[PDB]
Amino acid sequence: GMFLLQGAQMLQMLEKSLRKSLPMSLKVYGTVMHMNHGNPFNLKALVDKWPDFQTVVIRPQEQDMKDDLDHYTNTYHVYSEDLKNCQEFLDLPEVINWKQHLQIQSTQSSLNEVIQNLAATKSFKVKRSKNILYMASETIKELTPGKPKAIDPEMFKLSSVDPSHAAVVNRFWLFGGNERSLRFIERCIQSFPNFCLLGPEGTPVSWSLMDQTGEMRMAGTLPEYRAQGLVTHAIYQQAQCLLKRGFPVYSHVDPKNQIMQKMSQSLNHVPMPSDWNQWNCEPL
CATH class of the missing domain: 3.40.630.30 (Gcn5-related N-acetyltransferase (GNAT))
Known part of the structure; x- marks a missing residue:
C-alpha cells in the first residue's frame, strides 16, 4: 500500500519504531527526529502499511522540487525490512520521481540491489557514494547497546x-x-x-x-x-x-x-x- 503519515502522533510512532532498527535505520531515524522538531525542510513520511510498515521513505514536497537538476533538494531517505517490498514501494510514482536528478540516502547498504534493479526498470543511471559510518560512543550506549x-x-x-x-x-x-x-x-x-x-x-x-x-x-x-x-x-x-x-x-x-x-x-x-x-x- 501507500500511506502518508499526518500529525505528531504518527510521526512520533514512526520515530519510536525506527529506534528498534538502529544503526541501519539511522539515516531515516535522524530525519524523522527533525520532522518532529518543526520539520524545517517541509518533508513527508510515506510507508507501505501502518502501523506495521515494511518500507519507509522520507521525501520532499513536489512543489518545492521544481528544479529537476537540484539533487540537493531532491533527496529521499529510505529504510526497509523487506527488499522485495522496498522495490515495489519505490516503483510507485507518488513515492519517488525518477525523472529528476536525485539523491537517495540510507545507512542500509542492502538497498543497493533495489536501486540497481529500479535503474533497469525506471530508465536512470546511478553513482553510489559509500563512506564509513561513525557514531559517538555516547549515542551507541543509549540507542544500540574524548x-x-x-x-x-x-x-x-x-x-x-x-x-x-x-x-x-x-x-x-x-x-x-x-x-x-x-x-x-x-x-x-x-x-x-x-x-x-x-x-x-x-x-x-x-x-x-x-x-x-x-x-x-x-x-x-x-x-x-x-x-x-x-x-x-x-x-x-x-x-x-x-x-x-x-x-x-x-x-x-x-x-x-x-x-x-x-x-x-x-x-x-x-x-x-x-x-x-x-x-x-x-x-x-
Whole structure:
C-alpha cells in the first residue's frame, strides 16, 4: 500500500519504531527526529502499511522540487525490512520521481540491489557514494547497546556560522562549490545547529554543520588554517550540543581520509557495521 503519515502522533510512532532498527535505520531515524522538531525542510513520511510498515521513505514536497537538476533538494531517505517490498514501494510514482536528478540516502547498504534493479526498470543511471559510518560512543550506549587537543583561546573563539558566511563553507565543500549547493548550505545553517572556530580576525576558520537528517555534515577549514586540528574543535562542540539536546551524534568519513578517521577515533566516534550511502540518480 501507500500511506502518508499526518500529525505528531504518527510521526512520533514512526520515530519510536525506527529506534528498534538502529544503526541501519539511522539515516531515516535522524530525519524523522527533525520532522518532529518543526520539520524545517517541509518533508513527508510515506510507508507501505501502518502501523506495521515494511518500507519507509522520507521525501520532499513536489512543489518545492521544481528544479529537476537540484539533487540537493531532491533527496529521499529510505529504510526497509523487506527488499522485495522496498522495490515495489519505490516503483510507485507518488513515492519517488525518477525523472529528476536525485539523491537517495540510507545507512542500509542492502538497498543497493533495489536501486540497481529500479535503474533497469525506471530508465536512470546511478553513482553510489559509500563512506564509513561513525557514531559517538555516547549515542551507541543509549540507542544500540574524548577531547580536542588544546588551542590558544586568545587566537580562536567558538561561535556559530552566520548565514552571511555560508559562502565560505560552500567554497570548500568538495560536493558543493556551486549555487544550488550554496542554497542547501544556507538552509542547513538557518535550520540546524552549527559550530565554528573564529580566527584572530573574527571570521570562521573551521566549521561543523548539520543537515535535515541530523547528521554532522560539511566540516571544513580555511586552507591557511589546515593541519592545526581546528576542525576537531568544531565537530567536538557540535557533538556535545547534540548529546545535550538528545539527538544522535553521527557522521561519515571517506575511507581514503585517514586524518578524519584519526580525528573521529580521538573523539571516541566508532565506525559502525552499517555503511553510509548516497545513490546519485539521474535519467538516461
